[PDB]
Amino acid sequence: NNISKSAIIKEGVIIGENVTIEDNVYIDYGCIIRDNVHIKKGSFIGARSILGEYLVDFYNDRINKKHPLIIGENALIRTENVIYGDTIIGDNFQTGHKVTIRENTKIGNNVKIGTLSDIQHHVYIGNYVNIHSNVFVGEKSIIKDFVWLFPHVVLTNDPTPPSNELLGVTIELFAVIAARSVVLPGIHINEDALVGAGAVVTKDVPKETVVVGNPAREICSIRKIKNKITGEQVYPWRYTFKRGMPWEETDYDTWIKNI
Amino acid sequence: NNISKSAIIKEGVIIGENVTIEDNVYIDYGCIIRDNVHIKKGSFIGARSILGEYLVDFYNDRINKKHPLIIGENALIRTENVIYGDTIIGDNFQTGHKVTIRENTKIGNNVKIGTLSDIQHHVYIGNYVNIHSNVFVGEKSIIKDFVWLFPHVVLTNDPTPPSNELLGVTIELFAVIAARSVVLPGIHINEDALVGAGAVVTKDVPKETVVVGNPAREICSIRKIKNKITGEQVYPWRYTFKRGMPWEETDYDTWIKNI
Amino acid sequence: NNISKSAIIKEGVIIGENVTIEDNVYIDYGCIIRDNVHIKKGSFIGARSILGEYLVDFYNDRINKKHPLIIGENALIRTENVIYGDTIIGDNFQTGHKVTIRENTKIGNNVKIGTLSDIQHHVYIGNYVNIHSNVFVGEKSIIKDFVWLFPHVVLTNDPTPPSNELLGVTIELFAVIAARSVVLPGIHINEDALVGAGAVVTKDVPKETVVVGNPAREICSIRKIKNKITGEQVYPWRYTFKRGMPWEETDYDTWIKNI
Numbered sequence: 074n075n076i077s078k079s080a081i082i083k084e085g086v087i088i089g090e091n092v093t094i095e096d097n098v099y100i101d102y103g104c105i106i107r108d109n110v111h112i113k114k115g116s117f118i119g120a121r122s123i124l125g126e127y128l129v130d131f132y133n134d135r136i137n138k139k140h141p142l143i144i145g146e147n148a149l150i151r152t153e154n155v156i157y158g159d160t161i162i163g164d165n166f167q168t169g170h171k172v173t174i175r176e177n178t179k180i181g182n183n184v185k186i187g188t189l190s191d192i193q194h195h196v197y198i199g200n201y202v203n204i205h206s207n208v209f210v211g212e213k214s215i216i217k218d219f220v221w222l223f224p225h226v227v228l229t230n231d232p233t234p235p236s237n238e239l240l241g242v243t244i245e246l247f248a249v250i251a252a253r254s255v256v257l258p259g260i261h262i263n264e265d266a267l268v269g270a271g272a273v274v275t276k277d278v279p280k281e282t283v284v285v286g287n288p289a290r291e292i293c294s295i296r297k298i299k300n301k302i303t304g305e306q307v308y309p310w311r312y313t314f315k316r317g318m319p320w321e322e323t324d325y326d327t328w329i330k331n332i
Numbered sequence: 333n334n335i336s337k338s339a340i341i342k343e344g345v346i347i348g349e350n351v352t353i354e355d356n357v358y359i360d361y362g363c364i365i366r367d368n369v370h371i372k373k374g375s376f377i378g379a380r381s382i383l384g385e386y387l388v389d390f391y392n393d394r395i396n397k398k399h400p401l402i403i404g405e406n407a408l409i410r411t412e413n414v415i416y417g418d419t420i421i422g423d424n425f426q427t428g429h430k431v432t433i434r435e436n437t438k439i440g441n442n443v444k445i446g447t448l449s450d451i452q453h454h455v456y457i458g459n460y461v462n463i464h465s466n467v468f469v470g471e472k473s474i475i476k477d478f479v480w481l482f483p484h485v486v487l488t489n490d491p492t493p494p495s496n497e498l499l500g501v502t503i504e505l506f507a508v509i510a511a512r513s514v515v516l517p518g519i520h521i522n523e524d525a526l527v528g529a530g531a532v533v534t535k536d537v538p539k540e541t542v543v544v545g546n547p548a549r550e551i552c553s554i555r556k557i558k559n560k561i562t563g564e565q566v567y568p569w570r571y572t573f574k575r576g577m578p579w580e581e582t583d584y585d586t587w588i589k590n591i
Numbered sequence: 592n593n594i595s596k597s598a599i600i601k602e603g604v605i606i607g608e609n610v611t612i613e614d615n616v617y618i619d620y621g622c623i624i625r626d627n628v629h630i631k632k633g634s635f636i637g638a639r640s641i642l643g644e645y646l647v648d649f650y651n652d653r654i655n656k657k658h659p660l661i662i663g664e665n666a667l668i669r670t671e672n673v674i675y676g677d678t679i680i681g682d683n684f685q686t687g688h689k690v691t692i693r694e695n696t697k698i699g700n701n702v703k704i705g706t707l708s709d710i711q712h713h714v715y716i717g718n719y720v721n722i723h724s725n726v727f728v729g730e731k732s733i734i735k736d737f738v739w740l741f742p743h744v745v746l747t748n749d750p751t752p753p754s755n756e757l758l759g760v761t762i763e764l765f766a767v768i769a770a771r772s773v774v775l776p777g778i779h780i781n782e783d784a785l786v787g788a789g790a791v792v793t794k795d796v797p798k799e800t801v802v803v804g805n806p807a808r809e810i811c812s813i814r815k816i817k818n819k820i821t822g823e824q825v826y827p828w829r830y831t832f833k834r835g836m837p838w839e840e841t842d843y844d845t846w847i848k849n850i
């Protein structure tokens with residue numbers, strides 16, 4: 074292995090082989106770090122998380138194959154997160170409790186995944202994505218930057234289940250999926266779209282449109298929505314909300330000009 | 333610390349500083365009791381629960397600030413519950429497995445919180461409240477006494493997400509929210525109201541009214557409902573159901589006269 | 592006890608009394624095997640699972656009564672599964688992470704139960720049943736062979752809650768319940784029926800019928816559905832899908848003739 078002298082590793086932690094733990098990493102009580110896990114500098118790993126969780130091939134003969142997991146700098150992973158090998162997570166990642174993340178998945182930078190979320194295999198999550206509590210992200214889903222998935226959202230992938238050909242959902246830049254919504258397989262939710270709470274999204278959602286209901290139907294442009302408190306137009310949200318965003322200290326327009 | 337000689341503390345338990353464990357408390361295998369936790373007499377804490385879980389300020393410098401957690405007498409907390417500091421829980425509390433309860437939250441007496449439920453910060457839960465499996469209780473929610481939240485209910489708080497001003501849901505005395513229902517931000521669900529399974533509640537619900545659907549619509553008075561088995565009028569439920577309630581040994585009317 | 596010399600039992604495992612662990616069983620780090628647990632040959636038990644979890648009577652006096660749990664051969668149970676006593680699980684069972692299974696429950700052979708699922712007490716699950724992530728299975732539910740419950744499905748049982756007389760849902764052979772659907776108490780979902788994603792099923796569903804919506808309504812025969820990719824008729828699914836099924840190596844028709 075390769076573990077930093079500044080790493081703090083609490084009681085009960087179990088470490089395997091070919092593990093690299095960088096500087097100022099703190100691994101809380103009881104974590105099990107399985108083989109082929111690389112934890113980048115400054116990260117915190119919550120108690121009893123299990124990192125480099127076994128892929129299916131392990132069970133053939135109980136011999137652990139090599140499926141490297143890398144976690145980026147400064148993660149803040151909370152308790153009992155389970156993360157599979159063959160997955161890459163970027164920097165400043167943060168989680169709630171008991172989150173599960175499968176293999177062959179890629180998660181960008183400054184992403185947040187709340188308590189109980191279940192991210193499946195072969196999932197793509199871009200940067201500054203915010204997934205709240207108990208969100209199910211099915212295999213093949215593609216979540217672009219700045220997307221928000223609120224509690225209990227479920228992204229499906231088998232159009233006529235059970236079947237052999239899956240179609241993942243693709244969620245474009247800044248789209249917001251409100252709580253307890255379910256999206257059907259292969260659906261494209263376009264930029265700056267808003268899917269209202271509890272919707273059953275059976276059709277693509279056009280850019281800057283609001284849909285609600287079961288099945289969800291277009292109700293209006295996102296720009297029509299007013300703040301319930303202040304009466305100000307809310308969307309695109311990038312102009313009215315910036316806590317934790319990269320243009321927090323400036324403004325979106327100046328920010329975007331720079332990138 | 334201050335731990336009772338009658339307390340039973342199983343193998344693997346980890347105890348921090350400024351912890352008080354009263355008489356006849358039983359802490360099962362592997363719990364991690366973090367600093368500033370007070371567990372009242374006669375309580376049972378399920379294996380691997382983590383009590384006094386770290387608030388956000390801890391991560392600034394990995395130095396644990398003081399945020400006291402108090403749990404009342406006779407709790408029956410099941411496995412792997414995670415409970416934050418700056419929270420108060422009353423007596424005879426009981427939980428299912430893997431429940432998460434955040435900080436700055438207040439939970440009354442004789443409350444039950446089922447498996448997987450995720451109770452956020454700044455939540456108020458009164459007495460004799462029954463929250464079932466995997467219920468999401470958002471920040472700012474106010475749940476009055478005798479309310480029932482059935483499996484997979486979700487109480488939201490950001491009316492035009494993501495935004496800066498949250499509005500919590502308030503659920504009044506005895507109201508019942510059936511399974512897989514979602515309530516929108518700032519909604520008032522009045523006394524003895526019934527929200528039918530799977531509803532999307534977008535408007536306040538008047539006292540003793542039944543609403544169902546997406547969006548939920550008023551269908552009738554609660555008093556119209558008949559028991560599917562016995563044909564007897566069911567509601568107000570306080571008159572037809574009393575298992576585990578304070579008037580269990582008497583009757584509601586005599587009971588209420590006394591308080 | 593009775594533990595096989597070929598059993599592999601990792602660090603931190605806690606074993607009680609009257610436990611039988613057969614040949615080639617592998618119990619991962621930190622499992623707690625409570626009294627009266629029988630694990631059949633060749634099974635794998637994921638880290639930190641808790642087997643023979645305490646029934647309610649234990650809490651009367653903290654004295655553990657006898658409530659035997661049996662798990663069949665070749666199980667592949669993943670991490671942190673919690674399984675109660677007075678329950679029987681058949682062979683080739685497999686689970687995802689953090690699944691909870693209560694007492695007085697019977698689970699057949701070649702069944703799969705995904706991450707977070709919460710199976711209550713007095714539940715019957717037949718063979719080759721596939722329950723996905725975070726499915727709630729209420730007390731009294733009866734799930735026949737080959738049924739599929741997709742993510743976030745919830746089967747209820749109190750028709751006018753809270754009440755004293757529960758009615759479980761019965762799901763017949765091969766029926767498929769798509770994601771985020773909720774079924775009301777006492778509902779009969781017949782053979783080869785399809786409940787579309789996110790439905791609120793308030794009425795029995797006839798054999799080979801598709802229902803969708805809130806409340807769910809019949810839309811067509813299952814045989815009308817075409818594969819979204821190939822345009823081939825999909826259902827009965829037993830003729831178009833067989834990965835992991837008993838007729839995988841042959842065909843359903845020849846297979847059924849033999850049984």
Ligand SMILES: CC(=O)SCCNC(=O)CCNC(=O)[C@H](O)C(C)(C)COP(=O)(O)OP(=O)(O)OC[C@H]1O[C@@H](n2cnc3c(N)ncnc32)[C@H](O)[C@@H]1OP(=O)(O)O
Nearest residue numbers: 223224251252269270285286470488489490491493534547
């Ligand atoms: C979990 C957390 O921590 S916070 C979760 C984040 N927030 C959420 O999930 C909820 C966010 N809010 C929503 O999703 C809302 O549904 C919105 C913003 C889309 C609703 O848009 P609104 O500003 O309420 O438009 P408005 O309420 O004036 O339009 C209401 C009409 O459409 C209906 N409607 C509004 N929202 C919905 C909905 N989600 N589903 C079905 N119908 C709806 C209303 O009942 C009303 O019908 P009416 O014509 O009979 O009066």
Ligand SMILES: CC(=O)SCCNC(=O)CCNC(=O)[C@H](O)C(C)(C)COP(=O)(O)OP(=O)(O)OC[C@H]1O[C@@H](n2cnc3c(N)ncnc32)[C@H](O)[C@@H]1OP(=O)(O)O
Nearest residue numbers: 482483510511528529544545729747748749750752793806
């Ligand atoms: C998880 C556990 O352990 S138990 C969970 C606790 N129980 C539950 O969550 C379910 C409780 N039951 C409900 O919520 C029910 O929906 C009730 C009690 C509100 C339904 O009231 P009912 O007594 O069924 O009235 P009833 O069924 O006669 O009225 C039915 C009409 O309204 C419709 N309807 C009834 N309930 C709903 C619903 N939840 N959503 C949408 N429509 C509904 C029916 O389909 C029917 O429509 P129709 O006019 O075409 O026939």
Ligand SMILES: CC(=O)SCCNC(=O)CCNC(=O)[C@H](O)C(C)(C)COP(=O)(O)OP(=O)(O)OC[C@H]1O[C@@H](n2cnc3c(N)ncnc32)[C@H](O)[C@@H]1OP(=O)(O)O
Nearest residue numbers: 211229230231232234275288741742769770787788803804
């Ligand atoms: C989580 C995982 O890993 S995968 C989860 C497994 N897969 C799922 O849960 C989703 C499976 N798919 C479904 O359940 C679908 O709803 C199906 C297959 C029942 C839909 O049948 P379809 O083949 O899409 O029929 P189709 O789409 O042509 O009929 C669509 C019409 O009914 C409506 N409709 C279709 N499905 C639904 C639904 N679930 N709820 C409400 N309305 C629906 C459509 O909006 C459309 O309405 P329209 O007349 O205005 O055009």
Ligand SMILES: Cc1c[nH]c(=O)[nH]c1=O
Nearest residue numbers: 151168169170188387388
């Ligand atoms: C800030 C915060 C986010 N998510 C959590 O799970 N806990 C916290 O304290």
Ligand SMILES: Cc1c[nH]c(=O)[nH]c1=O
Nearest residue numbers: 410427428429447646647
């Ligand atoms: C009675 C009971 C309630 N809740 C649980 O999680 N387990 C139990 O045994």
Ligand SMILES: Cc1c[nH]c(=O)[nH]c1=O
Nearest residue numbers: 128129669686687688706
């Ligand atoms: C194949 C598979 C199924 N379910 C899981 O939880 N993990 C896996 O690797």
